[PDB]
Every structure is written in C-alpha cells, then in structure tokens.
RNA sequence: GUGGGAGAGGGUGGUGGAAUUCCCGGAGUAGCGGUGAAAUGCGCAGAUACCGGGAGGAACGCCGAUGGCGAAGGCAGCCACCUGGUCCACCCGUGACGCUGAGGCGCGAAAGCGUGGGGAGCAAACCGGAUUACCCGGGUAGUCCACGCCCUAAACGAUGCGCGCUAGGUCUCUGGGUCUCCUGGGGGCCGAAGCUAACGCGUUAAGCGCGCCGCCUGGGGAGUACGGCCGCAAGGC
RNA sequence: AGCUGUACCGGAAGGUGCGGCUGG
C-alpha cells in the first residue's frame, strides 16, 4: 500500500509528531521513497526536511539495525 | 571457565575472509576463529565452506567454555554470510536473534581507487 | 530587508501626485534605496561575487532611467539628483 | 625488409620493426662506423640493423637476452662473419671485460642499439655510470625522452636525466623517425640520439653523492621556488634554513628561481657551496 | 521582529530544585534579549532514539517566542553555555502545511 | 506598485550523526591483509575480530529523481542572519524610458604558485612485490582553511543575444482560476509545414524573418618564429 | 573505449594524479 493512505490527516512541518513521522521510515531509520510514501514532490521535500530536523532533536533514529537474516 | 552460558557472536564477513568472534553479553570476547585458523590459505579463506568451518569451530570452542545460546550479529557482505549463519544455527547453540550491523559511511572518508567511480 | 514601511515612506515622499507609484522619480528613489542597502552588504561581505552582479544591474537600470529623465525635462533631473545625492 | 619480413616470420611459425631500408643506413651514417670502429649492438632483434651495419662494420658484437630469438640469428646472418653473439644481459654483464677481450684487436667501439624504451634508459645510465672507454652511443629512444636527454635548461624538458648525461657525456637529437614506418603504428614518435663521452666529469667531482642528492632535491617539486624545494626535500634543512639563505647569496643564485631554470655550472657551484658549509 | 520556536533538550536527571533553577535561568536569558513569550509547552521526558551525552533520556522544553531577528544567533550562543542543556534549536515559526485532507 | 510562490542561487556565523585513522583501558590468541592466483607488508614488544573512553581532519548516506537554482563556472546534513535573480495574479502608476555592444571593468572547474596554518582518508613523483603496461603494499607534493596570484578545457546543447510568426501528442517541476478542464513559466521525448550533404532539427528550431556583435578563406609547417602586453614562474593573449 | 586542460615521470612503443566530455 502507501504510507499516506495508511494514515489520517496530519501536518508535514511538525518536527515533534514522532508517532506519525516514524511511519515514513523503513525498518532501518531511512526515509522511504515516494514509491512507498505516496506523496507529491513538494510533500516529499517538506517531509524529508522535517525528518532531518527531528533526527537532530534526537526523536528519530539516524540509523538502526534490521532484525533479519 | 567463564561459564557465561549465554553470549553473542560477531561475524565479520569480508570478500577475502570470514572471522567469527564469540563474546560475553558485556562484549569482551571469549573465543574466536577464522578461515585461516582451520588451515586454508589464500583465496580458499573466502569460500563459503571456509565460513562454515570457521563458524563450527568457534561454536565448538564456545561450548567448551560452557555457552548454551547466543545472539548473532553479522557485519559486512562477504561470500560467507549466509553459510556462516546457517552453520552457527544448527551447531547446537540456540540462536535467538540475527542482526545485520553493516557499518557504512554517511559519505565520509574518500574510498580507495578500486572502490571509487561510484555515482 | 526593506520593510513595507520604508518603501511606502519613500514612495509617498517622491510621488508627483497622490497615488503615484510609477513615475521615474519613484523608480530612481527605490533603486537608490536598494543600491545603498546592497552596497553596505557587499562592503561587509567581500567574497559575495553573486550579489555584485545584482548591484551592477541595479546601477545600470538607475543610470538608464536618469538618462531618460535628463533628456525629457532637465529641471526635474537636477532636482532629483541633488535631493538624492547622486553623483556627488 | 617488408616483403621478406613476412616470409621469415611465417617460415618459423611466428615487436616493432624498421622494415624500411634507407633510414637504417642513415642512423649508422650519423653513427659514423667504419673498418676503424667496432659495434656493440644490444637490440639486434631479427638482425635487420645488423646486416646493413656489418655491410660496413669492423667488428660486430650482439647481445640477445632471450634464446627463443637465438635459433634464427645464425641462419639469418649466415653470410656475415663479423657477428659474435653474447647471450648475456648487458645490465647483469661486465662490459669492461668484453671490451678488453673481443675488441682487443679492433680499434674503437660505438654502441648502436634498437631496443624497447622501458629497457632503454637504465641501460644507457649504466653504460654511463661505470666509465667505460668507448667512443659513443646511438639509440632511438622515444623522442619525448631524447629531448629530455638534451634539454636546454628550460622548456619542460630540463629535468634530472639532462644533468646526469650532460655531466657524463654530450647529447644532441640526431634524427626524427616519422611514425607508421613500423608495421604496427606505435601511436608515438621516436628520435635517434647520439651520446659522445668525455675525458673526466663536465664539472667538479667534489662529491658525486651530494651532487646527485642536491639534483634530486631541487627537482622533487618541479613547480616550486628553489628555496622551498631545499627547505622541504633536503634532509632536515628546516633548522638549516638560514644556512641555505646564506649560501645562496654568495653563489649569486636567487631563492625564488625555480631550480628547473639552473645550469650544470650553477648546480656544481651550489653542490660545492652547501657541502663543507651545511656540515 | 519575527516569531521563533526555541527547543531545549536538557539533563533528565535533575531534581525539582535544579530543574527549577535551570528553567529560571533560561527564562531570564530569554527575557534578556528583548524576547516575548507567546506560549510555553512542557513535554517532560521522552525516549531518545539514540543516546545524547551517554544518557538515553531528555527533558524537553518548547517555547514560542517573538523577538528581534539580529539577536537570535546570540541568544542560541547564550543558551548553549550551561552544561545541563544538551540541545538548543531555534527555528522560524512556519505554517502547518496540510496534506491528505 | 500591491499580494503571494518555488528553489543544492551566494556570503557569514553555529552545531549533528555515520564512517576511516590514531591514542588510552578491558577481554582474548595466532594469524591478519591482499590477488585471477600470489607476493611485499603488519603481527608473540600480542596483530585481526570485540567492547568502552578520548583526539583530529575531511565529506555529508537514506530522501534523490530523466528533479531544482544560477549568466557561465558551478551549487546537496541542519539552524540563524545578511543578500542576488525569477514566476504568477490584480491590470493600479510612468508613457518608447528599447535591443545589441569594438574597447573597458568584473566573475571564471580542475591542475599549478607565494605568504601562514592544517593534515584523517586518498594520492602524481618516488620506494618496494608479483607479472611489458596492468595489478598489490607504502608514500612527498597535492587535496582543506585565510589572504594574494594564475585565467585554461571535450569552459559542450561542439548551437551568440533580443523580438515576432508557423499542426499537434505525451511525461514532468512550479503558480492562478469558473478545478472532467482552462490559462502562465521552466525541463524532457515523438512528430505537421519547412530546413539539411546526410545524420538529424522541428514553438526550448538547425523553419520563416528583422537588428547588433564575434568568427571562417585548403592541409602540414604551427598556436611555432619574431615583436608587443600580462605573470613570481609555469605560461596566457 | 577513447579524447582533453593541467602537473609530474632515472622500467615512456607511453604511464599516472586531479577534474571534464561522449565525439564509446
């Protein structure tokens, strides 16, 4: 599916709303492409900026470990 | 001796070698083995079979120190990754978690000439 | 940046008649304001080679407007040039 | 011989060749070999040069390092009698003995060679190093290298080879070989140069070691002030900076001079200057 | 004369006294630079996705302020001097761009 | 002029994490590294693999794109300040105020130079190992910063700038509206008429026209010679 | 796979370093 579809209404510029932002990160703490998030470019740009900001604030992980083979 | 009975395993998988290091929860290594320790030299060290024997040998030693179960962490993307995981899985230790921990730069130091040309 | 207040006061000062925003005098005054601000900036920032082009363009535009004004009515040109302190 | 080359290669089941005739005579014309002068050839190959050389050579010694090419040297040089093959590497040999032995009856020798360039320069350097009593050398040696061998003291050619040879011998470009004469086009031009030895060194023999050390030091960072070169490359020299500044004054060489713009005379003067003053 | 959001992440292992003192000092410093507080939000304790100063806990303060621009940098330089405060971030108050509605 | 919009446009401060190297502490022992296969090298003064702390330099993974911005060169972590260009709507103001431009003046990747710092990784020259180059292990300049020079290129879309006219279809970035659609500005593919020696171009013209500038006159010798200007020099015109 | 600006080359039938181009 898509991350946007698997979500209600929310703000993209909210750099503290961790519960929604975590939905846009893969198993590893990496930003998902538009292929997965299902956003327009402007939306993707704003989301990536916010993600980086939250990363700095320590709320979101820069990197992590995938628990598989 | 240590009789920790529960530790973890670090599998450094390279293109040239595979090294398995068994360790306590605290991270202090207890025993280790590689492709070279078995007796292989040169390119033979890189083979998946070498990785299998390395994993089995390290596991046997760790059992001799009285372990029962580990938590395997794999680093690198060499040719002995899956073979080492499989070997350690059925060696008798009760592996609980398999974790990928490949350390990659965030576009840091400039790589060697052979590894450059990357877009 | 130039706030709306700063611009407005200049517009309402240099206007020929009330509601005028587009006479040559108003354009020259606004360009002068921009040029002064940018000159201060560039005086501080020596290695801002990208803004210097902006300054050159602004100066050129001001010179063209002044040439036209002088050609049309010399008196207004003299009054403007003295009141703005251009070329002195 | 272009027509005969194919025949000879095919007849044995078989690499750059001077197939053409006129110029092989011209190179030995410049080489000036007679019944009075013998020849040591190190690159005989198939023996193309050897035939026309021995047509007017006093004595012919040839060095072949590979015995795969050996079986064909005899039968291709059947009529000629002057030929004597020493299946020895010239670098690993002792040319002094061979000079004393084969050419004892003969009068003079001038080396003429045609060998791959990746082997050329070390051989010439060795033949110069050991002070053999031979008249001269004639080699075609990748023109871009020959210019560096001659290399008037400027124009991107005056390096360190230039100083060495001009300290040992004389050099000057003799002939340009037009491309494509070789059956495989070598994508590069070659030049025949001649070296003529001299009686003793060109300049002071005060310290060969220190002279060459200074030569190497001054040309490490070619694009650099000579003073910077010396303070950098010369051993320590950081704490001896003031000494260098001192010595450069009385030698009448300016600090900011880009050592690539020096003469052998100036280099000799500086070699004498720094030695016995630096330490 | 613009609107900013000031985020402070400070040492979580502060008792009532120390925490009150830190809040008071940062408030005084904020007021010192001609800043006016529109609102304050106290999010308390949160779980940091990675350790900061070896401690996986952080105390979060969020101020909406309105202040002169040419001061803001200095303010940050002022607020980052205490050893108790770990992270200080000042961001221009933007608008809530709404999508998926 | 008013209202709004997008952006790795530029400069100055300041901090975030990943990774490499090095130092210290702990635990543990015989290889590690490297290749097509090996060797040089490092290691019993304890190397590799592991955990913890510290030092420093350089670059910013995911998003990231056939994307965006700039006159070109070129420009990617994030925050703030200062600042240039540009688009759209309203159609409010001036009333031809325009286009181009020999000289001049400024900018100008990389590689180089001078005066001082800095130096983690990589790496000309150089030093060694295998097998002619290639490949492997080291390594100075250099790569980084400040100031001052240098002024070159496959500096390219090999296409000078401005304006007007001449079928469309499709993808995409970004504004506006009366939002199935309509109307602006960028970036790409396929194609009417037409053009071209052909390849191909084709509303982003290499079509049809007007204005201004630059340049060409068979190859080699030759970007060489001499002269002049500039540069510390290499060299540039 | 070549080409190119610049800088070196005491194992130059040419090689390498830093960038650029497709005229592969």
């Amino acid at each position: 599916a898509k991350v946007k579809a698997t979500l209600g209404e929310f703000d993209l510029r909210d750099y503290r709303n961790v519960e929604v932002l975590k939905r846009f990160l893969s198993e590893t703490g990496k930003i998902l492409p538009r292929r997965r998030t299902g956003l327009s470019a402007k939306e993707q740009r704003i989301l990536a900026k916010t993600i980086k900001r939250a990363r700095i604030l320590g709320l979101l992980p820069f990197t992590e470990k995938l628990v598989r083979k | 001796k240590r009789q920790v009975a529960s530790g973890r395993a670090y599998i450094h998988a390279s293109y040239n070698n595979t090294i398995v290091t068994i360790t306590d929860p605290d991270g202090n290594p207890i025993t280790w083995s590689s492709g070279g320790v078995i007796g292989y030299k040169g390119s033979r060290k890189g083979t998946p079979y070498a990785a299998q024997l390395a994993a089995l040998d390290a596991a046997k030693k760790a059992m001799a120190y009285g372990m029962q179960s580990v938590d395997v962490i794999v680093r690198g993307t060499g040719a002995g990754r899956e073979q080492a995981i499989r070997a350690l899985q059925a060696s008798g230790l009760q592996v609980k978690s398999i974790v990928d921990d490949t350390p990659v730069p965030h576009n840091g130091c400039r790589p060697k000439k052979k590894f450059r040309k990357a877009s | 940046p130039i706030t709306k207040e700063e611009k407005q006061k200049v517009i309402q000062e240099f206007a020929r008649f009330p509601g005028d925003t587009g006479s040559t005098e108003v354009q020259v005054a606004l360009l002068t304001l921009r040029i002064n601000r940018l000159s201060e900036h560039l005086k501080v920032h020596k290695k801002d080679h990208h803004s210097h082009r902006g300054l050159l363009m602004m100066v050129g535009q001001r010179r063209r407007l002044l040439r036209y004004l002088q050609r049309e009515d010399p008196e207004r040109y003299r009054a403007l040039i003295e009141k703005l302190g251009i070329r002195g | 011989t272009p027509i005969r080359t194919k025949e000879i290669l095919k007849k044995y089941g078989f690499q750059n060749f001077l197939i053409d005739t006129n110029i092989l005579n011209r190179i030995v014309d410049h080489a000036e070999v007679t019944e009075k002068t013998g020849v040591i050839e190190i690159g005989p190959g198939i023996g193309a040069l050897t035939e026309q050389l021995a047509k007017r050579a006093k004595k012919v010694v040839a060095f072949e390092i590979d015995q795969r090419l050996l079986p064909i040297l005899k039968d291709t040089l059947s009529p000629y009698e002057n030929v004597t093959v020493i299946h020895q590497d010239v670098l690993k040999a002792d040319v002094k003995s061979v000079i004393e032995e084969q050419f004892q009856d003969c009068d003079e020798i001038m080396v003429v060679a045609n060998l791959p360039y990746y082997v050329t320069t070390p051989i010439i350097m060795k033949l110069l190093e050991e002070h053999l009593p031979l008249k001269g050398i004639v080699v075609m040696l990748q023109k871009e290298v020959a210019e560096r061998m001659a290399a008037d003291p400027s124009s991107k050619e005056y390096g360190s080879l230039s100083i060495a040879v001009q300290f040992y011998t004389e050099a000057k470009t003799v002939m340009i070989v037009p491309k494509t004469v070789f059956v495989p086009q070598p994508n590069v031009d070659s030049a025949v140069i001649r070296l003529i030895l001299r009686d003793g060194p060109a300049v002071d023999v005060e310290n060969e070691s220190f002279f060459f050390q200074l030569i190497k030091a001054s040309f490490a960072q070619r694009r650099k002030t000579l003073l910077n070169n010396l303070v950098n490359n010369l051993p320590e020299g950081k704490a001896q900076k003031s000494t260098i500044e001192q010595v450069l004054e009385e030698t009448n060489i300016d600090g900011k001079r880009r050592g690539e713009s020096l003469s052998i005379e100036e280099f000799a003067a500086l070699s004498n200057g720094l030695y016995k003053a630096l330490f | 004369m613009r609107r900013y959001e000031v985020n402070i992440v400070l040492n979580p292992n502060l008792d009532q006294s120390q925490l009150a003192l830190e809040k008071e000092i940062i408030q005084r410093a904020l007021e010192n630079y001609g800043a006016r507080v529109e609102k304050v939000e106290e999010l308390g304790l949160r779980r940091l996705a990675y350790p900061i100063a070896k401690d996986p806990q952080g105390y979060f303060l969020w101020y909406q302020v309105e202040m002169p621009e040419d001061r803001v940098n200095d303010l940050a330089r002022e607020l980052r001097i205490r050893d108790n405060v770990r992270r200080v971030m000042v961001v221009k108050s933007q608008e809530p761009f709404l999508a998926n509605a």
Side-chain angles (χ1 to χ4, degrees):
Chain A
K2 295 304 210 295
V3 180
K4 172 170 141 199
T6 313
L7 193 59
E9 193 282 297
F10 79 114
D11 167 35
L12 277 83
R13 265 198 262 268
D14 204 322
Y15 64 101
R16 305 134 77 193
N17 190 354
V18 291
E19 48 274 13
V20 301
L21 288 178
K22 284 176 73 61
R23 300 216 61 143
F24 295 98
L25 303 192
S26 64
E27 183 63 31
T28 316
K30 299 194 275 182
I31 308 148
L32 278 191
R34 298 201 309 122
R35 173 177 50 265
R36 297 270 287 278
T37 71
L39 307 158
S40 90
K42 181 202 276 200
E43 296 168 23
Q44 180 79 16
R45 268 187 263 113
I46 295 177
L47 169 76
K49 179 78 59 181
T50 295
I51 288 290
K52 293 172 208 183
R53 219 183 279 188
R55 279 182 178 175
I56 283 169
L57 262 189
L59 295 172
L60 300 197
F62 274 107
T63 59
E64 53 163 276
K65 282 72 65 180
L66 62 96
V67 287
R68 275 309 168 184
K69 67 224 180 180
Chain B
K1 165 65 177 182
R2 299 278 277 268
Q3 318 297 103
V4 295
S6 182
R8 41 186 199 169
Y10 289 102
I11 303 183
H12 180 282
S14 176
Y15 270 38
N16 296 296
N17 211 299
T18 318
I19 302 150
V20 185
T21 313
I22 318 287
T23 181
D24 57 9
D26 285 339
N28 314 292
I30 192 169
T31 192
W32 70 271
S33 180
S34 69
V37 176
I38 311 146
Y40 296 159
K41 301 300 299 297
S43 182
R44 269 147 67 79
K45 296 188 284 168
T47 66
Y49 187 71
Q52 172 183 359
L53 275 76
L56 293 198
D57 179 27
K60 161 175 76 70
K61 277 156 91 187
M63 281 181 166
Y65 288 167
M67 265 175 215
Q68 289 276 85
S69 65
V70 291
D71 266 345
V72 59
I73 301 144
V74 51
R75 298 215 168 111
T77 185
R81 195 155 42 61
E82 213 66 16
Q83 193 91 33
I85 301 302
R86 275 147 57 204
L88 188 46
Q89 215 158 7
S91 179
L93 296 191
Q94 183 259 318
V95 300
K96 320 156 201 65
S97 60
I98 307 165
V99 162
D100 179 80
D101 189 272
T102 318
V104 300
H106 286 191
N107 202 238
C109 285
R110 174 201 198 102
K112 285 185 66 52
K113 182 268 183 179
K114 193 166 61 56
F115 299 133
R116 289 182 69 255
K117 313 290 179 181
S119 183
Chain C
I2 298 147
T3 59
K4 213 233 169 157
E5 185 179 17
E6 324 262 46
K7 233 206 273 186
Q8 275 319 297
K9 84 174 72 147
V10 169
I11 294 167
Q12 69 153 46
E13 193 289 340
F14 274 95
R16 302 304 305 284
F17 57 88
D20 178 12
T21 59
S23 63
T24 314
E25 280 98 349
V26 175
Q27 300 186 41
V28 166
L30 296 168
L31 273 171
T32 313
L33 175 62
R34 291 187 80 197
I35 281 163
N36 293 131
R37 293 287 198 84
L38 187 47
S39 293
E40 305 184 12
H41 165 70
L42 288 165
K43 174 186 300 310
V44 167
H45 301 257
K46 296 276 175 176
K47 305 313 195 257
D48 189 16
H49 293 307
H50 277 77
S51 297
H52 197 260
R53 174 170 173 267
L55 170 65
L56 286 187
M57 287 158 81
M58 285 176 192
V59 159
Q61 185 60 38
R62 184 175 75 182
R63 267 178 70 262
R64 265 172 274 154
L65 289 177
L66 266 171
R67 177 189 298 139
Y68 162 72
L69 182 69
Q70 172 195 36
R71 171 156 37 81
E72 288 321 278
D73 185 77
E75 168 55 17
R76 296 163 52 230
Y77 160 73
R78 267 186 320 283
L80 188 64
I81 195 163
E82 60 77 12
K83 199 184 77 145
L84 272 170
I86 305 166
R87 185 66 273 179
Chain D
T1 299
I3 190 150
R4 185 211 31 67
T5 306
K6 264 72 175 185
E7 307 155 4
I8 302 309
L9 285 186
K10 180 172 208 68
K11 275 187 296 189
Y12 294 78
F14 271 61
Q15 285 183 44
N16 309 316
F17 305 84
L18 272 300
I19 53 164
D20 52 344
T21 58
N22 61 324
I23 67 172
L24 281 174
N25 305 101
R26 277 209 279 244
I27 61 181
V28 293
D29 277 315
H30 306 92
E32 306 282 5
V33 60
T34 65
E35 275 301 324
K36 187 264 178 184
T37 312
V39 167
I40 293 165
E41 181 164 352
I42 305 163
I46 79 156
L49 189 47
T50 71
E51 59 82 21
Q52 79 89 20
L53 181 138
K55 262 180 77 66
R56 59 207 204 185
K58 163 66 162 180
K59 190 46 193 58
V60 180
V61 160
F63 284 75
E64 279 287 0
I65 61 150
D66 296 330
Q67 50 268 10
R68 187 167 50 81
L69 195 69
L70 197 146
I72 71 152
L73 65 84
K74 284 181 179 74
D75 54 0
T76 47
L77 291 178
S78 283
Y80 321 107
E81 59 80 27
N82 293 292
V83 292
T84 295
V85 283
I86 311 300
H87 190 65
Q88 196 73 26
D89 165 80
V90 59
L91 286 163
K92 195 53 64 63
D94 47 350
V95 186
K96 176 67 66 60
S97 75
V98 187
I99 284 296
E100 288 296 89
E101 287 141 24
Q102 185 68 79
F103 294 88
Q104 190 69 83
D105 47 50
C106 169
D107 205 359
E108 267 302 337
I109 312 97
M110 290 178 85
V111 165
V112 172
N114 167 35
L115 78 156
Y117 310 137
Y118 84 99
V119 183
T120 299
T121 186
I123 293 190
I124 314 179
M125 272 323 301
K126 181 217 174 182
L127 267 288
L128 263 69
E129 279 297 334
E130 59 203 359
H131 299 89
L132 292 173
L134 81 159
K135 183 173 178 74
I137 300 155
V138 163
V139 183
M140 50 97 79
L141 73 166
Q142 168 61 65
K143 163 194 174 282
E144 292 176 350
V145 185
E147 313 179 68
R148 174 152 272 183
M149 308 290 279
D152 69 317
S154 198
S155 301
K156 304 292 287 197
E157 298 285 6
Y158 188 82
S160 66
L161 273 179
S162 319
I163 311 179
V165 289
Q166 284 156 4
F167 182 74
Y168 274 16
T169 62
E170 288 109 345
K172 57 166 59 48
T173 317
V174 192
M175 183 147 187
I176 303 300
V177 174
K179 199 176 84 184
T180 75
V181 290
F182 313 75
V183 164
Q185 66 281 345
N187 198 10
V188 76
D189 303 333
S190 177
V192 164
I193 214 164
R194 83 152 174 256
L195 279 299
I196 43 162
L197 276 84
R198 289 172 296 174
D199 47 351
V203 284
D204 302 323
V205 71
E206 201 275 324
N207 280 110
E208 285 310 308
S209 45
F210 181 65
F211 175 74
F212 284 161
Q213 201 194 13
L214 196 145
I215 293 312
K216 213 44 73 190
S218 70
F219 278 91
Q221 292 81 62
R222 178 149 176 149
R223 291 290 92 218
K224 200 89 70 180
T225 287
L226 168 69
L227 176 58
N228 282 355
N229 274 314
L230 286 190
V231 68
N232 291 8
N233 311 127
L234 195 81
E236 35 274 347
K238 195 71 180 74
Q240 286 85 12
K241 169 82 174 298
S242 58
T243 298
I244 322 295
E245 305 178 2
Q246 280 284 345
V247 299
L248 260 69
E249 194 286 336
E250 282 82 11
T251 317
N252 298 335
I253 313 183
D254 191 13
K256 42 189 185 291
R257 214 184 177 277
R258 264 80 183 178
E260 57 88 24
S261 76
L262 260 64
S263 64
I264 178 163
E265 300 77 15
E266 285 279 31
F267 268 131
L270 202 65
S271 277
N272 301 333
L274 272 177
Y275 213 83
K276 204 200 174 181
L278 180 64
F279 57 92
Chain E
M1 193 63 204
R2 299 173 199 179
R3 199 153 295 100
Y4 303 94
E5 300 176 353
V6 185
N7 309 63
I8 318 296
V9 187
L10 77 156
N11 195 311
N13 319 314
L14 298 192
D15 58 1
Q16 183 59 257
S17 67
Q18 283 165 125
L19 187 136
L21 194 142
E22 282 305 329
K23 202 167 308 197
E24 193 279 336
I25 194 157
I26 65 168
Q27 165 65 94
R28 210 184 320 121
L30 186 71
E31 193 280 333
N32 185 280
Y33 279 84
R36 164 193 160 276
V37 185
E38 269 180 24
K39 69 200 300 284
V40 183
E41 194 158 286
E42 287 276 325
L43 272 84
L45 269 158
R46 299 201 69 80
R47 273 280 336 286
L48 306 189
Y50 63 89
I52 301 177
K54 279 85 153 197
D55 189 358
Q57 291 276 54
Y59 204 71
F60 282 85
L61 323 173
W62 178 87
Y63 294 100
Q64 183 173 53
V65 79
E66 195 274 335
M67 68 181 289
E69 58 287 334
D70 66 351
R71 309 295 296 281
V72 298
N73 290 71
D74 279 355
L75 174 62
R77 190 217 321 291
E78 184 40 60
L79 292 194
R80 264 194 273 266
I81 197 59
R82 297 310 306 277
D83 61 37
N84 309 95
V85 289
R86 273 82 197 279
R87 287 264 208 278
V88 170
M89 185 165 80
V90 178
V91 286
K92 275 182 61 51
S93 178
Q94 264 169 324
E95 290 314 316
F97 178 85
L98 299 173
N100 182 251

